[PDB]
């Protein structure tokens, strides 16, 4: 029975836990902007087929395939993780499409796993685009029986579009969301200006990313915090709701918008707990007149011996009607935690997109050369077709046919087998010229691919073209409006 | 001697006690999870081994003010199952089990749970470490399912690759498809496995927790477990770098 010093054990164990949480649970990879649990739910969904062309799958099947093949922790906190990705008051660009009761902006919980249905969204298909083309390193899973992606191609700047938020050990991260079109203007800059430095790029992006854009609308008040956060990785951004005064002989306060991540039920309860305390006089009654048809609507009749501006500002003060989003841009870069400026986030994502397109082009090239090296042996079999048919028929086995095929022409075993497997269908007139034409087209494509691998100018071009395809189809108007103070 | 719940108890409900009445031969397994505690209730030697399972993570007793801690049912359970008492009221004469085995997953969350467990023991019950009562049980990582012969268990990828090589070289035979079962926690094990690998005295792999210096432990605990976030951040940043090279 070996001894162990309590000091050594406490150290080795707490360090292992804390580094595991920092790198593999709480904090988002900088490229695709995902924690592991997110990457593994999206990936098991993709792999299972639950795409938007096909009918929503019972939401228990995604949890089961995620925990079975990739993510060995509890079904409970995988259902919750999946559910959050389908709430539109939680994701500015939701990645899961939910049929059923997925909660509400308040405290209504979601229906149990057995009731809901769920599939991927089109943008989430763009997180996975061409993941089957060697565009990302895969590693073996928790039991080696299958493989998982370390990262997703993330053909849109997900980390900034959707934010992240997470408590780790010794630190914590809170990246807000942003408008996809604005983020794409900044990425377009970093592409047209690839050689530019950090001073210049930080200037240009801060100028195209006017600030956070929250799913919940609302307002950002003050330009400083936005700018702090983007320039130093940390900053305190004050958000406000929207109040709409309405004048039976009664004057009212209608809240239609709130700051991101403000619980609607806890909000009402705080007003009613500070009017029960009696430190927000001036209110006749609080009534949630809210429903799915009118949206958020918390009408707040006020007393006829109270003024509107005064009471609004009391609410800004004592409640979360205004409140402060405390960014700490923190993400995992190359396996380690790093706080980052807005120029380091955009650039790091961009370098990822270029990585992905030079990898996909490498894959496409190798497969083109495979198919061409085959086609070449087939056309050599066509120009001497009578010799080859006669040879095979006269052979005794298929290996003997094959050896004779490699004798007659100058082909590999791959090429001789590809002629052997060749079906009679292809020895028709139009089909032989199809083989010829095909060899020609594939050599053209091979040239195009070599050319793209030579020229980074071309690789940045493909990123701009494909991301604008995406942003035109899926981008949307800015929600949170920006004011000054 | 001490009386063990049977029908009349006066002890925790989750506790599954032992038949023996003599603390010098009795052992209490504190076990992460009700699945794993349940399957250790079955695999044990009912004579001498008791089982207190824990729902997941325990309360951090160093961040948590003394009052919330005594109202916490799991901590109150761990205390009642030991008989001693806490702080100045502690009495090792009333100790119920002369071996206390912490058995948690071989995953980082079992390390966190065995860290929340050794923080409690050290602050409320220091003497139990000082006298070498508190052990840690090392769970296995692989079952090797030879075809014709008994399975082997393996506690490190080194041992797994050694046992696979040695058996194959001895002419033993193993399926490629279902042949080596990697465990990811104690809940994945039946009662016979738990016995044959962490509860049978004759094949157990325990580690005795000792205390060289109760003053640098005091500051270590303070750093890792307490409310000073900066001290933590600095500690992890200083020591994460050299985790792969501590035993060379």
């Amino acid at each position: 029975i070996e001894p162990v010093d309590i000091e050594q054990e406490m150290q080795r164990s707490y360090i292992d836990y804390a580094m595991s949480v920092i790198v593999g649970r709480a904090l988002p990879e900088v490229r695709d902007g995902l924690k592991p649990v997110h990457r593994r739910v999206l990936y098991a969904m993709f792999d299972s087929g639950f795409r938007p062309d096909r009918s929503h799958a019972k939401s228990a099947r995604s949890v089961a395939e995620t925990m079975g093949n990739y993510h060995p922790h509890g079904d409970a906190s995988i259902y919750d993780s999946l559910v959050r990705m389908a709430q539109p008051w939680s994701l500015r660009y939701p990645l899961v499409d939910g049929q059923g009761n997925f909660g509400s902006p308040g405290n209504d919980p979601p229906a149990a796993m057995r009731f809901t249905e769920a599939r991927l969204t089109p943008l989430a298909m763009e997180m996975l685009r061409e993941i089957d083309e060697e565009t990302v390193d895969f590693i073996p899973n928790y039991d080696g029986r299958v493989q998982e992606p370390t990262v997703l191609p993330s053909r849109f700047p997900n980390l900034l579009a959707n934010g992240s938020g997470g408590i780790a050990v010794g630190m914590a991260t809170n990246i807000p969301p942003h408008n996809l079109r604005e983020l794409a203007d900044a990425v377009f800059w970093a592409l047209e200006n690839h050689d530019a430095d950090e001073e210049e790029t930080l200037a240009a992006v801060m100028g195209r990313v006017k600030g956070p854009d929250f799913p919940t609308a609302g307002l950002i008040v003050g330009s400083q915090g936005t700018a702090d956060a983007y320039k130093t990785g940390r900053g305190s951004i004050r958000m406000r709701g929207v109040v709409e005064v309405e004048e039976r002989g009664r004057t009212s306060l209608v809240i239609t918008e709130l700051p991101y991540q403000v619980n609607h039920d806890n909000f009402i309860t705080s007003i009613a707990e500070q009017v029960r305390d009696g430190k927000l006089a001036g209110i006749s009654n609080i009534e949630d007149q809210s429903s799915d048809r009118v949206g958020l609507r918390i009408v707040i009749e006020i007393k006829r011996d109270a003024v509107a501006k005064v009471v609004i500002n009391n609410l800004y003060k004592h409640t979360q009607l205004q409140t402060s989003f405390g960014a700490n841009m923190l993400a995992i870069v190359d396996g380690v935690p790093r706080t980052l400026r807005l120029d380091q986030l955009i650039r790091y994502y961009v370098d990822h997109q270029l990585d992905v397109i030079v990898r996909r082009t490498t894959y496409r090239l190798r497969k083109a050369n495979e198919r061409a090296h085959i086609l070449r042996g087939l056309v050599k079999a066509l120009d001497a077709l009578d010799e080859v048919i006669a040879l095979i028929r006269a052979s005794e086995t298929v290996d003997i046919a094959r050896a004779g095929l490699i004798e007659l022409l100058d082909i590999d075993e791959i090429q001789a087998q590809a002629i052997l497997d060749m079906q009679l269908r292809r020895l028709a007139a139009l089909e032989r010229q199809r083989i010829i034409d095909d060899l020609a087209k594939i050599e053209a494509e091979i040239a195009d691919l070599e050319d793209i691998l030579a020229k980074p100018e071309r690789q940045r071009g493909i990123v701009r073209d494909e991301l604008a395809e995406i942003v035109d189809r899926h981008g949307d108007d800015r929600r949170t409006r920006i004011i000054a103070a | 001697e001490l009386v063990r719940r049977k029908d009349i108890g006066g002890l925790p409900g989750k506790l599954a006690d032992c038949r023996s009445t003599d603390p010098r031969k009795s052992e209490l397994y504190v076990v992460e999870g009700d699945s794993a505690g349940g399957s250790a209730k079955s695999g044990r030697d009912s004579m001498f081994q008791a089982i207190l399972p824990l729902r997941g993570k325990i309360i951090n007793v160093e961040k948590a003010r003394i009052d919330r801690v005594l109202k916490n049912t799991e901590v109150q359970a761990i205390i009642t199952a030991l008989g001693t008492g806490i702080h100045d009221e502690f009495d090792i004469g009333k100790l119920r089990y002369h071996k206390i085995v912490l058995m948690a997953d071989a995953d980082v969350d079992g390390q966190h749970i065995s860290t929340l467990l050794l923080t409690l023991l050290f602050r409320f019950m220091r003497p139990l470490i000082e006298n070498g009562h508190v052990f840690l049980a090392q769970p296995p990582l692989y079952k090797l399912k030879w075809q014709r012969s008994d399975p082997e268990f393996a506690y490190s990828d080194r041992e797994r690759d050694g046992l696979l090589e040695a058996g194959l070289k001895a002419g033993k035979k193993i399926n490629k498809e279902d042949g080596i079962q990697r465990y990811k926690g104690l809940g994945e094990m039946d009662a016979k496995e738990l016995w044959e690998t962490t509860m049978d005295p004759s094949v157990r792999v325990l580690r005795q927790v000792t205390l060289d210096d109760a003053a640098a432990a005091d500051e270590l605990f303070s750093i890792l477990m307490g409310e000073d976030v900066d001290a933590r951040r600095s500690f992890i940043t200083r020591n994460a770098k050299d985790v792969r090279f501590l035993d060379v």
Binding site: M19, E198, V333, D334, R338, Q344, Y348 | T237, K241
Partner: peptide
């Protein structure tokens, strides 16, 4: 966890 790279060279 060693303090290398940051911009250029990524983070190490």
């Amino acid at each position: 966890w060693t303090x290398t790279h940051x911009x250029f060279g990524x983070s190490x």
